[PDB]
């Protein structure tokens, strides 16, 4: 029996502390803590509703774009503005391409070194490694020659004595299970991923004006001026350039990222049977395509008690059932007001008093849906799509399963998706489906401009009296995001963000119920309490972002 702390948790965005009680070699109880606060909700208060998005985008630069888009949607909700369809297409392209970058970086730069041992890679035979992937991937950069160059770079790094970010890593740990050859394959893919994520952000930059932190939005649409015949604006040459980067993403996603996901599951199959965070899941529909902020390409919904068969669909960002369920508590958080609050009536009054196991121990609030804890993010979004009978999602999941089957002789059932590896699989499925979103929305944009519609912006009016409430929903890389704006006498009188990492990472709630990160760790085997790799494996599967969770 003993008490450990993991502080800082690395290979996440932001500042996270995890504490665990370990009994008889397994975690028996856990605490998640966000250790940095800025007060972004207070910073944006009393400003013009049109300004909010440029300020609150700075909640996070990893999930850049997301808070910007959620903020304009919130002001649009309050003001009753219908966004021009060309502005929906542009916003959708940006979100889809951003998310592609975000998920690739998570799987490789943030998560792979939980599962992959770089020292073991030095022992690999590059020819045997290449041979292992025959009939498993058609990727053009799995040759022995590619793998030998990568092995030599690792060799040179180790020989210099300056391991830097690779130093004091969990090399030779008993939970590291890959053969040398598979370790070398993963490091080669890690480096290749950096090129493909750059291509995704070239899409974002051409519409956003730069990334991180896009600058093309507005309450009322976008600032891109569509004119096929115009010099220095969004013309056909610029659109062709965008398309040239969209076309570069699919092969990496399908032939490297999707395959590696199945390979990791095949070598770590006990991770299909642990890391369950919740029994309830929530996602919002995303990528609207009509003239009235609807007709979403991806569905949403609510699953209760893991029952896909009886889920409740959500098809609108104005759904009163969704809106009315959401509250946050600060009983075990460092804020003053503790009872559950609907976010239009939310407060964020700091009340730091240090760490207590049974009192306050985090800057993250505790969100609930009609009083229940809920997991959000790619596992939620996948399970909802399967519940909706979405064929695209079923088919892509089956492709990952088939690779797993071929490697192990075993299959994967939906029950095994409620796990650390299931969560990773949801993220990979999302990434693959986003490539069809990109092709679909580029084609829609080209077709619509061809009909003679170049409209991008509806100038808002904001009444100087009255009190108006708006909420902007968005299915972000890490799950359902919502910004809640109250306008009074022309200015922002309340602003509250409820962010996907808030739902997952938040501490024990008003009824002392346990949220997803803390719940997922119960039962985790920990072979060496001084080097708790197994805990970090499960926490990474949620893709934590603490600037997002706390703001």
């Amino acid at each position: 029996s003993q008490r450990i702390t993991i502080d800082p948790v690395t290979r996440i965005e932001g500042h996270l502390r995890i504490d665990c009680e370990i009994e008889n070699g397994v975690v028996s109880k856990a605490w998640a803590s966000g250790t940095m606060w800025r007060g972004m909700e207070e910073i944006v208060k009393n400003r013009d509703p049109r300004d909010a998005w440029m300020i609150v985008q700075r909640i996070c630069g990893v999930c850049t774009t997301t808070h910007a888009l959620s903020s304009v949607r919130a002001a649009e909700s309050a003001l009753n503005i219908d966004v021009p369809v060309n502005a929906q297409y542009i916003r959708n392209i940006i979100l889809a391409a951003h998310t592609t970058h975000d998920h690739i970086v998570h799987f490789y730069q943030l998560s792979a070194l939980d599962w992959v041992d770089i020292t073991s890679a030095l022992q690999a035979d590059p020819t045997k490694a290449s041979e292992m992937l025959k009939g498993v991937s058609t990727w053009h950069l799995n040759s022995p020659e590619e793998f030998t160059k990568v092995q030599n770079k690792i060799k040179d790094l180790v020989a210099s004595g300056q391991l830097g970010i690779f130093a004091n890593g969990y090399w030779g740990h008993p939970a590291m299970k890959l053969p040398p050859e598979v370790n070398l394959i993963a490091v080669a893919h890690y480096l290749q991923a950096l090129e493909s994520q750059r291509d995704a952000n070239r899409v974002v930059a051409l519409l956003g004006g730069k990334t991180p932190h896009i600058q093309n939005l507005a309450v009322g649409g976008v600032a891109n001026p569509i004119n096929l015949d115009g010099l220095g604006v969004l013309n056909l040459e610029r659109l062709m350039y965008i398309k040239s980067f969209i076309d570069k993403l699919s092969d990496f996603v399908e032939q490297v990222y999707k395959v590696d996901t199945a390979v990791i599951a095949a070598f770590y199959p006990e991770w299909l049977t642990r890391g369950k965070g919740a029994v309830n899941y929530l996602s919002v529909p995303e990528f609207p395509t009509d003239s009235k902020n609807g007709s979403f390409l991806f569905p949403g919904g609510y699953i209760e008690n893991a029952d896909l068969s009886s889920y409740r669909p959500i098809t609108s960002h104005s759904d009163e059932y969704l809106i009315k369920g959401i509250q946050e508590s600060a009983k075990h958080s460092w804020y003053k007001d503790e009872a559950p609050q609907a976010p239009w009536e939310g407060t964020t009054i700091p009340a730091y008093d240090g760490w207590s196991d049974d009192g306050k121990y985090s800057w993250v609030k505790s969100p609930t849906f009609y009083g229940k804890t809920v997991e959000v993010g790619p596992l939620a979004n996948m399970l909802v799509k399967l519940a909706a009978g979405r064929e695209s999602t079923q088919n892509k999941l089956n492709e990952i399963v088939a690779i797993y089957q071929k490697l192990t002789g075993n299959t994967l059932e939906v029950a095994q998706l409620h796990s650390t590896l299931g969560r990773i699989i949801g993220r990979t499925v999302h990434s693959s489906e986003l490539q069809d979103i990109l092709q679909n929305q580029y084609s829609a944009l080209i077709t619509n401009i061809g009909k003679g519609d170049h409209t991008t912006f509806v100038k808002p009016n904001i009444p100087a009296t009255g009190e108006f409430k708006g909420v902007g929903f968005l299915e972000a890389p890490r799950g359902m995001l919502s910004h809640w704006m109250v306008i009074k006498d022309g200015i922002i009188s309340n602003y509250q963000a409820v962010v996907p990492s808030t739902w997952n990472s938040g501490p024990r709630n008003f009824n002392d119920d346990v949220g997803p990160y803390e719940q997922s760790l119960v039962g985790t085997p920990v072979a060496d309490p001084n080097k708790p790799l197994e805990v970090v494996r499960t926490i990474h599967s949620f893709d934590p972002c603490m600037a997002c969770a706390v703001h």
């Binding site: 993991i6 300056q162 004091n168 001026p225 604006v233």
Partner: protein
Amino acid sequence: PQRPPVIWIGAQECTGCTESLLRATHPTVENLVLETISLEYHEVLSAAFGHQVEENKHNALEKYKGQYVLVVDGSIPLKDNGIYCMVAGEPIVDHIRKAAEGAAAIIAIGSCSAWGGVAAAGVNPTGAVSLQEVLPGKTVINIPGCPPNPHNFLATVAHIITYGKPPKLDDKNRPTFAYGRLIHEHCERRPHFDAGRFAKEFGDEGHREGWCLCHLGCKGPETYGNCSTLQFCDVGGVWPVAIGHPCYGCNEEGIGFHKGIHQLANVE
């Protein structure tokens, strides 16, 4: 062959400043960490966590005493004894001050560390301040922007390595190759400004011909930077004004995060 060591500490950051490195092409992030420098501490990319990564930092500060470049992103919160940002149970201001004692050079990357930025705006809930304010006896090199073009940082580090000293700096300690001139004093839309050719609203006829964004709130007239020349992401033609949105002044203290998007600049 040995690479120059770098220690990177995040304070009240959004991580945008690290994410800028993933867009860079000269060097790419992979060539940066394998060829150009030895990244001895960086919490976003480090294999090690918790006790092991704090071991790496202590080892590196001693091993490379007097030789490493210290980089900070985010503001430093001083309200209520530093508790608004706590790492391994201690205020980030203490981590930063200790690392600063043995630094060869110190860089504030982004507007937050350079002057307080968005985190210090409005009522300033956490008493956020700049890196130079935390380190009054040290020369801090300021690379502002939210975030800056990553090469504003990488070419500063390269000048230090190749030529043995910082690049030339202005009176706010910003490198002149990147921040030496107002955006409005090197903006391709100046001809339209000069002729009174102004967009009045996004999507209007002037906007759709690439006219000047002054009357939409462009802060170019009061913001130092290289956004119109170096621009962003190395694809050609990409910066906020070229895309159709005014400059917000994110580089510049008292402009970005203080003035409204559509509030007009003072023009000289």
